[PDB]
Amino acid sequence: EAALRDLDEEGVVRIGAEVKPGDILVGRTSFKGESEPTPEERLLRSIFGEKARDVKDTSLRVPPGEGGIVVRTVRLRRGDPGVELKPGVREVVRVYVAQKRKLQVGDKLANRHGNKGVVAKILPVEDMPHLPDGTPVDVILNPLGV
Amino acid sequence: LKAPVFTVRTQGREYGEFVLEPLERGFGVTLGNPLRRILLSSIPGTAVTSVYIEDVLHEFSTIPGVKEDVVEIILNLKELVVRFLNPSLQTVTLLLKAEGPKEVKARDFLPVADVEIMNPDLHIATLEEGGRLNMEVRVDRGVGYVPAEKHGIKDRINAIPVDAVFSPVRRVAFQVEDTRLGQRTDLDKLTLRIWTDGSVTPLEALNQAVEILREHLTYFSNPQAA
Amino acid sequence: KAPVFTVRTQGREYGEFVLEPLERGFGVTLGNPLRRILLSSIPGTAVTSVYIEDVLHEFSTIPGVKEDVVEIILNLKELVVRFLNPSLQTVTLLLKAEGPKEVKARDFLPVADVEIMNPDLHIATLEEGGRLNMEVRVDRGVGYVPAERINAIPVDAVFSPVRRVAFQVEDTRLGQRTDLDKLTLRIWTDGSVTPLEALNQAVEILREHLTYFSNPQAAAVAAP
Amino acid sequence: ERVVRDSLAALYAEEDGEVAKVDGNRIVVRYEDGRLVEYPLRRFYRSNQGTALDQRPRVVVGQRVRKGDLLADGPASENGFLALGQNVLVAIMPFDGY
Amino acid sequence: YYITQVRKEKKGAGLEFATPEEALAAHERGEVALNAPIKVAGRETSVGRLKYVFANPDEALLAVAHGIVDLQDVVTVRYMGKRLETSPGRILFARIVAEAVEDEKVAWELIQLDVPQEKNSLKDLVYQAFLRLGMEKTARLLDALKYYGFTFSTTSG
Amino acid sequence: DEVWDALEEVIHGKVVLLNRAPTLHRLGIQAFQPVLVEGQSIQLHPLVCEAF
Amino acid sequence: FGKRKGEGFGVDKREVEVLRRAEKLGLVTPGKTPEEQLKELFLQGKVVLYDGRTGEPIEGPIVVGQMFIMKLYHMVEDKMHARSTGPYSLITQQPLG
Amino acid sequence: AEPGIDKLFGMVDSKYRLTVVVAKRAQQLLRHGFKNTVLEPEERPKMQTLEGLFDDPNAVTWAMKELLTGRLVFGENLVPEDRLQKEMERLYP
């Protein structure tokens, strides 16, 4: 239930949930290997009390390095009004996730004069160069670029 | 036989100038800078750690009857300065209930004992007819800049973690001018100019900064073999 | 989580002192002020003047003496003098030996409560017929003082027993935090004051200077 | 200014009038002709490239609008002028090889 | 480069003198600049070359630390039993290479002390360090040059 | 937070290859020992920038 | 610089040092007041900056000012990738996305 | 970098020889679990943990540090392979 806590009844994740990489966006199950379990698995399933089942976990999770706060969801099904999809597919879910990215090391900054570069360091304000009135500068640009 | 004069000028809780003269040549910088560093960084304070809004599931939502989007709202609450009068108090959750054609400010927060809003006239949101805004704003004590992504277990499920910049110190400058014992023309007149948010007094800030520096100088006392 | 302070020493001349871990930015915050103090404020002794009997000025040369006046002055700037008595301020040492003999710093006439840390320091090589008579003035002071009776020559005086201070602040990690600080501080002294002693004195000077914020005398804020 | 104008990312005043209702999701105005019109605002919308296209209303309730006046800022526009970034304090110097 | 380069001041205007003390006097009056070509007595010598004489490299550096003189200003320094006319900055660079390779004499053989260090001279220093000393020692020299180069380039202005 | 202490043990003594395309000569691929860092960027020594 | 005097402050000894080096470099006319020398420097778009770490000034003046800078769609978050093992191609049997 | 690399280069007539030798010696130290090392306890390569100094997990560092002592013997056709394997397995199971 630890992994399932953020999913609603249908299995879709709840709007506004914070999802990290690996957390399930949509649950799904699909029939595994022509309903043929491997014999080595069949006994260990019985040791633990019949965990053996017809289906396996195909659920859509959050890819590594990705994720954020769930914003929108769109579910469409076959056999429902106004909705028809490509042959063979019963239904389709869409999870629109948002994340607000603060500037970080490796991001690309550029002026309109063609000077471009990536942020290689973020300095604490006390480390910054400052005017005599104490105001620190925002960005330090290398003159060799000119 | 001469101990340097320590002078203080102060305007309200926001800004102060603090002078020490005469000092030995170079000591205006020697004292002046490391204080400035500690001031801008290591001085504890208070900032909004969280926001709940009724019928709002996440920061990217938009409230009916309210001009501001939830993001601009939290951007505003980032500017709220709250002063804790009791040193033992680590957290307060303010409450704000509002409706009708009202322009909400920080004054509209329900009052709490030993907790003072230093800028009640700070704009929060503009509501129109039909607009309803019900908020719970969690303010904590802390030090430095703690990003929202570092949040722990939140109070509610619709709780929105907010970026917290704790440091009460808004700006620190210092001037070192030449001064005279009258034989010695090369001495140092040091002046620390400090702007804060009103949560903490420039003199209070300065003092605990000096204390941080002293407590750090303490660390050189107990050597080890290498 | 109070930081560890480690000490590594070779003789009385040199030492390394490492303070870790410190919070972000603090390596420099401690490093800079101590260094500034270490180079100037730490008290010591230096030769502030020299008088030679046959020499009219710094740029002259002495017959029977290989090295010119300036070179001898340079040999005098490396002289390490310790005052055993706290009340002592100025001491004038005399060296009269003219013999065709190799002259060291040991040849100076001993004075009560004044110790020479480098007796083997070379001054001049005198030959047959050569004559050297000098009175050197040693004073107590701090830092470096440039040269700026009648034939007494002013000498650039290095009071600071600390010869060089260099610190490096390098990133370090304690558990989760990768941004912490390791402050390495290297101190070279002349042996008059051990590096550890100089460090302690610097720290003390800083603390005592932090005490000066204690007694406020108010003033009004100006407005236009 | 004209870039934001012709790109039609932002809402402008169609006719002289006065604005009745303002909030995050809509701006409703009344013109001299007594025309009541509700302009819905596109909020936090995913573009092809994944950037959020977000309209922020710049005008409050009971304000006089003139034809050609800006009601709501589009994505990346500040007061109807193109906003592609921030203005910052630059110091042009080498800093420690960073 | 910025630290190994030396200053040329035109205020001196190549005025010849006899007594060095005359030159010091003229300097103190504000006539002749600190670093200027000047002929005193027999030969050409800078004002600050006479004014400041250092028994130690780190004495000269200690002086620079006190704001007495800059690294670019040219002075007189005694280094390894030799009286040198080089600037504090070149002495500094010398010690940088020396400490980096941990061989002082060989370092003194490798460096070109009378020139401002630039691309090709540094390149040559590196190659010669690769030959005369180890490969890894050369790597250490590279890292040292990197550190100090960056450091000074920050505060160079 | 114990796992990273283990990763530090895994990569101890080991080195990784860094490569920048196009690889024009052999030095366009070099071996460095990795220093684990917070952040999503690879930190590269300035001196090797020329060869790469 | 004008309100500096109005608030009771003069020029830093550090600003004096910087100005000395500046007239040595030829950015400011010698003999004029520091009040004016700093004006000359500022007219060139350079000011006196202090190094926040050491509290000492950067030797010689430094250009500062407001520059408009954009953040670009290229972002390190989207551009980082790593693989130990994963899917392989059906036919070619080479690693696959 | 790594200590005494130039000397390791000096020990061989080709760099790739040094590479092959160090590599193979590393394989030896791994298969037999480092007990066959020619290094004395104080010469043992150490790694800094949270707990303290422990054996360096890296076999190549070990092989190189052993080779620098010159205690190892290398060259072509010293012994037959299988005999060497069986002897090493007998001495260090």
Swiss-Prot record, chain D:
Function summary: DNA-dependent RNA polymerase catalyzes the transcription of DNA into RNA using the four ribonucleoside triphosphates as substrates.
Similarity section: Belongs to the RNA polymerase beta chain family.
Subunit note: The RNAP catalytic core consists of 2 alpha, 1 beta, 1 beta' and 1 omega subunit. When a sigma factor is associated with the core the holoenzyme is formed, which can initiate transcription.
Protein name: DNA-directed RNA polymerase subunit beta
Organism: Thermus thermophilus (strain ATCC 27634 / DSM 579 / HB8)
Boundaries of the shown chain within the full protein: 585 to 682 of 1119
From Swiss-Prot, chain E:
Quaternary structure, from the entry: The RNAP catalytic core consists of 2 alpha, 1 beta, 1 beta' and 1 omega subunit. When a sigma factor is associated with the core the holoenzyme is formed, which can initiate transcription.
Function statement: DNA-dependent RNA polymerase catalyzes the transcription of DNA into RNA using the four ribonucleoside triphosphates as substrates.
Family: Belongs to the RNA polymerase beta' chain family.
Name recorded for this polypeptide: DNA-directed RNA polymerase subunit beta'
Natural source organism: Thermus thermophilus (strain ATCC 27634 / DSM 579 / HB8)
Range of the intact protein held here: 790 to 946 of 1524
Curated annotation (Swiss-Prot), chain F:
Function: DNA-dependent RNA polymerase catalyzes the transcription of DNA into RNA using the four ribonucleoside triphosphates as substrates.
Family membership: Belongs to the RNA polymerase beta' chain family.
Known partners and oligomeric status: The RNAP catalytic core consists of 2 alpha, 1 beta, 1 beta' and 1 omega subunit. When a sigma factor is associated with the core the holoenzyme is formed, which can initiate transcription.
Record's protein name: DNA-directed RNA polymerase subunit beta'
Taxonomic path: Bacteria, Thermotogati, Deinococcota, Deinococci, Thermales
Gene: rpoC
Residues of the full protein shown: 685 to 736 of 1524
Swiss-Prot record, chain H:
Family listed: Belongs to the RNA polymerase subunit omega family.
Annotated TM spans: none
GO annotation terms (biological process): DNA-templated transcription
The EC number(s) this enzyme carries: 2.7.7.6
Task of the protein: Promotes RNA polymerase assembly. Latches the N- and C-terminal regions of the beta' subunit thereby facilitating its interaction with the beta and alpha subunits.
Subunit structure: The RNAP catalytic core consists of 2 alpha, 1 beta, 1 beta' and 1 omega subunit. When a sigma factor is associated with the core the holoenzyme is formed, which can initiate transcription.
InterPro entries cross-referenced by the UniProt entry: DNA-dir_RNA_pol_omega (IPR003716), Pol_omega/Rpo6/RPB6 (IPR006110), RPB6/omega-like_sf (IPR036161)
Entry keyword set: DNA-directed RNA polymerase, Nucleotidyltransferase, Transcription, Transferase
Organism in which the protein naturally occurs: Thermus thermophilus (strain ATCC 27634 / DSM 579 / HB8)
Reactions performed catalytically: RNA(n) + a ribonucleoside 5'-triphosphate = RNA(n+1) + diphosphate
GO cellular component, one term: DNA-directed RNA polymerase complex
Protein name (Swiss-Prot/TrEMBL): DNA-directed RNA polymerase subunit omega
One Gene Ontology term of the molecular function aspect: DNA binding
Main EC class the enzyme belongs to: transferase
A Pfam family: RNA_pol_Rpb6
